[PDB]
């Protein structure tokens, strides 16, 4: 299964943008999102990713969750659902 180390390494370039008002996505953040997409191909990998993101969120303030929800589509990755702290990781498919 993908580790929290793997998730952090792929989405670390997204953190400064995740705290901003929006605008142009850093290419390294889109690259990071593509890498994470490539690692999370099973339900458990997506559930692990969800749990790693929620855990890291408790240690970071100033996050623009409305902007984070749309980041995949801005990076060319089509996603059925929005990334949300509200969503239970146990219900991620």
Residue numbers in the entry: 1 to 93
Paper excerpt:
Lipid transfer proteins (LTPs), also called non-specific lipid transfer proteins (nsLTPs), are known for their ability to bind and transport hydrophobic ligands. The biological role of nsLTPs is still not well understood. We elucidated the crystal structures of Act c 10.0101 and Pun g 1.0101, nsLTP allergens from gold kiwifruit and pomegranate, respectively. These allergens both belong to the subfamily of 9-kDa LTPs.
The model was refined to 2.4Å resolution. Similar to Act c 10.0101, the structure of Pun g 1.0101 is stabilized by four disulfide bridges formed by residues Cys4–Cys52, Cys14–Cys29, Cys30–Cys75, and Cys50–Cys89. However, the conformations of the protein molecules present in the asymmetric unit differ, and half of the molecules have a distinct conformation corresponding to residues 77–85. Chains A and B adopt one conformation, and chains C and D adopt the second observed conformation. Despite the different conformations, none of the protein chains have a ligand bound; therefore, the crystal structure provides insight into the structure of two Pun g 1.0101 apo forms. In the case of chains A and B, cavities with volumes of approximately 370 and 340 Å3 are observed, and in the case of chains C and D, the cavity volume is ~414 Å3. The difference in likely modes of ligand binding for Act c 10.0101 is not only related to the presence of the conserved aspartic acid residue in kiwifruit protein, but also the absence of a tyrosine residue in the Ω loop.
